[PDB]
């Protein structure tokens, strides 16, 4: 709704502001290391969080009540939420992409395969795909219902960031050398595929 | 309490009544007049109105349409679900 | 110029006018602080707009109200109405919308017509 | 412990230090200065006189480099580079001729600078860092021999990278900043990666040195030093210390190994008079020296000798201090 401002500090405080009047509003403090990512479901009811201490947080936004949290295996480096399917993806230090349900506070999937550090990732708009890119010069796509890596693209220069357009058409990459922003076209005419992994170096 | 109404819409239970106030606030109350929500304006100029409103059949949503190139979704609680538009 | 609003309210025959300007937290009734009202029993009824929203909520507010007309009780139903719409109409203009709904959502659950005046129109059924 | 004579090499300004390096056979300290000064002076713990300097006009220097410890050019030559896209030779045979090594073909100006470049152990392979992959060019005939495609995504000019004490032919350590991650490379066959692995970059991106390996220790901006064994890079890829060592209460921006890997040393630049140094393998804190009311200052750069007995501190007022240890 655009009313609220969520800010997470490196000493672990999560504070909450108004976006209209610029005023301090509300304060939460559960993490004890740097809060590396905050999001909120589209119904503005359940508030998720992540720390470097392997803790994933689950709050009511309507109250200040402390609903539930999880202990994981590694620090969490990035968090991107998908709103119309109520999931979220976490990039851990064990080079694995964990996919977690938002409703029932349950881990549902864990995906392996990137040989180096996960850099950026994004949900497809219909919520079926995840595209990540890493320092193994790979850009991989991951089908959530099958749990399997469906395509990698092995490039010659490693892109800093990637984002889907909200329309299902364009994929945006930003690279280290050169100043431009490369744009990719989602085909989206057809396919019946589920085919698989490792190929040419 | 407020604001001359034009749009009335009934729940299929006989228990809830949805009204459109004389501004962008769209409001609901039951048959024991407990006013649940009043809700925010109807945007998208290329003044603001409240012309028609309808209670969905499952009892979990209402749809607001004025005369301002916009149409809004709402649930029984407060939240703006989706705004489609021409 | 200072930011200020003005609302008012009325029970059966009394009327009561309220200014709301930014200040340091005072509540006066014609010459006198709020803790004095006398009937001496019903003073909780004018405390009602304060604790329903919370004790603080006034830290940059000043309130003065005044009373004309009415009997003993009906003055108090006026001034509990005047502070009620008075507080909301400050939040209309300088605090966000979303505070105001939270006043409206909390008041109307407890609603003894704090936002509408009662009006009697008898009728042969 | 013997409290030695205080620093005397002090700038006209309150100036700064590119990097510190030592001489292995005679007591001398090597210093690059941002004012285009390349000067090396004599230390005894009591001596602070300048021996010789080098100021090449028409050329500013912006980073420093200890050129080879042993090929044959340790006591004659030192190669440095500035912001300009080449690198200088310095010949004590003093000849000091400028061997213009701009002769990297088309990948020369792809850097903002050669601002971290590290020699191998036999000078036949010189490593050079990019905002970014690493160029391997022999410093003896002036041609781009080969290069390792260190992929890099966010690489913010990786500020410290060194081959290990267990043979350069084994692997090469390249510490990427802003992630804390650690690259390892098979030098003996270009394009082969021994084991890449996560060092903590949840906390800490600051620079390490090479132990050996025997131990590793890492340090953050939160007063926090951990001990990673080398073989914990094997799966699981994240390692764990034997203990978390905490003696600072504020930031730390220096880390410093012994030559036998048996000391660490940690320092900052936010508050005057604060530095520590921890013993290994015994996991011991050295509390005799230094203290918090002793002259230490807000340290920029710090270095031990190849002996590791002597401590060099270059802070932000112009001084360059030494200590016996």
From Swiss-Prot, chain A:
<comment type="function">
    <text>Involved in nucleolar processing of pre-18S ribosomal RNA and ribosome assembly.</text>
</comment>
<feature type="repeat" description="WD 14">
    <location>
        <begin position="156"/>
        <end position="194"/>
    </location>
</feature>
<protein>
    <recommendedName>
        <fullName>U3 small nucleolar RNA-associated protein 21</fullName>
    </recommendedName>
</protein>
<feature type="repeat" description="WD 11">
    <location>
        <begin position="35"/>
        <end position="71"/>
    </location>
</feature>
<feature type="repeat" description="WD 10">
    <location>
        <begin position="1"/>
        <end position="27"/>
    </location>
</feature>
<feature type="repeat" description="WD 12">
    <location>
        <begin position="76"/>
        <end position="111"/>
    </location>
</feature>
<feature type="repeat" description="WD 13">
    <location>
        <begin position="113"/>
        <end position="154"/>
    </location>
</feature>
<comment type="subunit">
    <text>Interacts with snoRNA U3. Interacts with MPP10. Interacts (via WD repeats) with UTP18. Component of the ribosomal small subunit (SSU) processome composed of at least 40 protein subunits and snoRNA U3.</text>
</comment>
From Swiss-Prot, chain B:
<comment type="similarity">
    <text>Belongs to the WD repeat PWP2 family.</text>
</comment>
<feature type="repeat" description="WD 12">
    <location>
        <begin position="1"/>
        <end position="39"/>
    </location>
</feature>
<feature type="repeat" description="WD 13">
    <location>
        <begin position="47"/>
        <end position="84"/>
    </location>
</feature>
<protein>
    <recommendedName>
        <fullName>Periodic tryptophan protein 2</fullName>
    </recommendedName>
</protein>
<comment type="subunit">
    <text>Interacts with snoRNA U3. Interacts with MPP10. Component of the ribosomal small subunit (SSU) processome composed of at least 40 protein subunits and snoRNA U3.</text>
</comment>
<comment type="function">
    <text>Required for bud-site selection and cell separation. Also involved in nucleolar processing of pre-18S ribosomal RNA.</text>
</comment>
Swiss-Prot record, chain C:
<comment type="function">
    <text>Component of the ribosome, a large ribonucleoprotein complex responsible for the synthesis of proteins in the cell. The small ribosomal subunit (SSU) binds messenger RNAs (mRNAs) and translates the encoded message by selecting cognate aminoacyl-transfer RNA (tRNA) molecules. The large subunit (LSU) contains the ribosomal catalytic site termed the peptidyl transferase center (PTC), which catalyzes the formation of peptide bonds, thereby polymerizing the amino acids delivered by tRNAs into a polypeptide chain.</text>
</comment>
<dbReference type="GO" id="GO:0003723">
    <property type="term" value="F:RNA binding"/>
</dbReference>
<comment type="similarity">
    <text>Belongs to the universal ribosomal protein uS9 family.</text>
</comment>
<keyword id="KW-0597">Phosphoprotein</keyword>
<feature type="modified residue" description="Phosphoserine">
    <location>
        <position position="74"/>
    </location>
</feature>
<feature type="modified residue" description="Phosphoserine">
    <location>
        <position position="59"/>
    </location>
</feature>
<feature type="cross-link" description="Glycyl lysine isopeptide (Lys-Gly) (interchain with G-Cter in ubiquitin)">
    <location>
        <position position="28"/>
    </location>
</feature>
<dbReference type="GO" id="GO:0003735">
    <property type="term" value="F:structural constituent of ribosome"/>
</dbReference>
<dbReference type="GO" id="GO:0000462">
    <property type="term" value="P:maturation of SSU-rRNA from tricistronic rRNA transcript (SSU-rRNA, 5.8S rRNA, LSU-rRNA)"/>
</dbReference>
<feature type="modified residue" description="Phosphoserine">
    <location>
        <position position="32"/>
    </location>
</feature>
<protein>
    <recommendedName>
        <fullName>Small ribosomal subunit protein uS9A</fullName>
    </recommendedName>
</protein>
<keyword id="KW-1017">Isopeptide bond</keyword>
Curated annotation (Swiss-Prot), chain D:
<feature type="repeat" description="WD 3">
    <location>
        <begin position="213"/>
        <end position="238"/>
    </location>
</feature>
<comment type="function">
    <text>Involved in nucleolar processing of pre-18S ribosomal RNA and ribosome assembly.</text>
</comment>
<protein>
    <recommendedName>
        <fullName>U3 small nucleolar RNA-associated protein 18</fullName>
    </recommendedName>
</protein>
<dbReference type="GO" id="GO:0034388">
    <property type="term" value="C:Pwp2p-containing subcomplex of 90S preribosome"/>
</dbReference>
<dbReference type="GO" id="GO:0030490">
    <property type="term" value="P:maturation of SSU-rRNA"/>
</dbReference>
<keyword id="KW-0853">WD repeat</keyword>
<comment type="subunit">
    <text>Interacts with snoRNA U3. Interacts with MPP10, UTP21 and UTP25. Component of the ribosomal small subunit (SSU) processome composed of at least 40 protein subunits and snoRNA U3.</text>
</comment>
<feature type="repeat" description="WD 1">
    <location>
        <begin position="12"/>
        <end position="51"/>
    </location>
</feature>
<dbReference type="GO" id="GO:0000447">
    <property type="term" value="P:endonucleolytic cleavage in ITS1 to separate SSU-rRNA from 5.8S rRNA and LSU-rRNA from tricistronic rRNA transcript (SSU-rRNA, 5.8S rRNA, LSU-rRNA)"/>
</dbReference>
<feature type="repeat" description="WD 5">
    <location>
        <begin position="294"/>
        <end position="325"/>
    </location>
</feature>
<feature type="repeat" description="WD 2">
    <location>
        <begin position="56"/>
        <end position="93"/>
    </location>
</feature>
<dbReference type="GO" id="GO:0000480">
    <property type="term" value="P:endonucleolytic cleavage in 5'-ETS of tricistronic rRNA transcript (SSU-rRNA, 5.8S rRNA, LSU-rRNA)"/>
</dbReference>
């Amino acid at each position: 709704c655009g009313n609220f401002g969520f800010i997470g500090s490196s000493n672990g405080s999560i504070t909450i502001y108004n976006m209209q009047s610029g005023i301090l509003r509300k304060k939460y403090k559960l993490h004890k290391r740097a809060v590396t990512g905050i999001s909120l479901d589209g119904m503005n009811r359940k508030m998720v969080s992540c720390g470097l201490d392997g803790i994933v947080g689950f709050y009511d936004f309507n109250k200040s009540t402390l609903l539930g949290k999880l202990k994981l295996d590694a620090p969490i480096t990035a968090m991107v939420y998908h709103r119309s399917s109520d999931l979220f993806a976490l990039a851990l230090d064990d080079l694995s992409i964990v996919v977690i349900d938002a409703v029932t506070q349950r881990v549902v999937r864990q995906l392996w395969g990137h040989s180096n550090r996960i850099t950026a990732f994004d949900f497809s708009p219909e919520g079926r795909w995840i595209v990540s890119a890493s320092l193994d010069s790979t850009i991989r796509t991951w089908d959530l219902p099958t749990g399997g890596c469906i395509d990698g693209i092995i490039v010659d220069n490693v892109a800093t960031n990637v984002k889907f357009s909200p329309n299902g058409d364009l994929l945006a990459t930003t690279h280290v050398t050169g100043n431009g922003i490369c744009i990719w076209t989602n085909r989206a005419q057809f396919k019946t595929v589920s085919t698989r992994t490792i190929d040419e170096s | 309490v407020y604001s001359d109404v034009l749009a009335l819409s009934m729940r299929p239970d006989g228990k809830e009544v949805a009204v459109s106030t004389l501004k962008g606030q769209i409001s609901i109350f039951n048959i024991e007049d407990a006013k649940q929500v009043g809700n925010i304006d109807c945007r998208k100029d290329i003044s603001k109105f409240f012309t028609t409103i309808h209670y969905s059949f499952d009892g979990m949503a209402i749809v607001a349409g004025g005369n301002n190139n916009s149409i809004c979704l709402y649930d029984v609680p407060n939240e703006v679900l989706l705004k489609r538009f021409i | 110029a200072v930011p200020s609003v003005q609302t008012f309210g009325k029970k059966k025959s009394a009327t009561a006018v309220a200014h709301v300007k930014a200040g340091k937290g005072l509540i006066k009734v014609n010459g006198s602080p709020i803790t004095l009202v006398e009937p001496e029993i019903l003073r909780f009824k004018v405390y009602e707009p304060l604790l329903l929203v919370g004790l603080d909520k006034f830290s940059n507010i000043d309130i003065r109200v005044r009373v004309t007309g009415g009997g003993h009780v009906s003055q108090v139903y006026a001034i509990r109405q005047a502070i009620a719409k008075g507080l909301v109409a400050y939040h209309q203009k300088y605090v966000d919308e979303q505070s105001k709904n939270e006043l409206k959502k909390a008041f109307t659950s407890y609603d003894r017509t704090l936002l509408i005046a009662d009006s009697r129109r008898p009728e042969p059924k | 412990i013997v409290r030695l004579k205080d620093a005397n090499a002090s700038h006209p300004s309150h100036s700064a230090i590119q990097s510190l390096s030592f001489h292995p056979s005679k007591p001398l300290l090597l210093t690059g200065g941002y004012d285009k000064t390349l000067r090396i002076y004599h230390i005894d713990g009591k001596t602070n006189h300048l021996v010789t300097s080098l100021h090449l006009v028409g050329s500013p220097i912006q980073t420093c480099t200890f050129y080879t410890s042993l090929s044959n050019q340790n006591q004659q030559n030192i190669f440095t580079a500035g912001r300009r896209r080449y690198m200088h030779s310095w010949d004590l045979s003093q000849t000091a001729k400028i061997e213009k090594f701009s002769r990297l073909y088309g990948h020369e100006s792809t850097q903002r600078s050669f601002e971290n470049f590290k020699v191998a152990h036999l000078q036949n392979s010189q490593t050079n860092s990019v905002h970014g992959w690493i160029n391997i060019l022999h410093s003896t005939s002036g041609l781009w021999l080969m290069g390792c495609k260190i992929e890099g995504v966010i690489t913010d000019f990786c500020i410290d990278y060194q081959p290990i004490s267990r043979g350069k032919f084994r692997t090469i350590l390249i510490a990427v900043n802003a992630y804390g991650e650690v690259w390892e490379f098979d030098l003996n066959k270009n394009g082969h990666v021994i084991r890449r692995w996560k060092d903590q970059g949840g906390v800490g991106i600051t620079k390490i040195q090479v132990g050996g390996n025997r131990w590793l220790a890492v340090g953050s901006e939160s007063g926090f030093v951990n001990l990673y064994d080398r073989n914990n890079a094997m799966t699981s890829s994240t390692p764990t210390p034997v203990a978390a060592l905490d003696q600072l209460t504020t930031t730390i921006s220096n880390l410093q190994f012994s030559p036998d890997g048996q000391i660490l040393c940690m320092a900052s630049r936010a508050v005057k008079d604060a530095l520590r140094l921890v013993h290994l393998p015994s996991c011991s804190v050295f509390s005799n020296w230094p203290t918090s009311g002793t002259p230490l200052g807000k340290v920029t750069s710090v270095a031990f000798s190849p002996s590791g007995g002597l401590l060099a501190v270059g802070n932000e007022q112009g001084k360059v201090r030494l200590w016996k240890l």
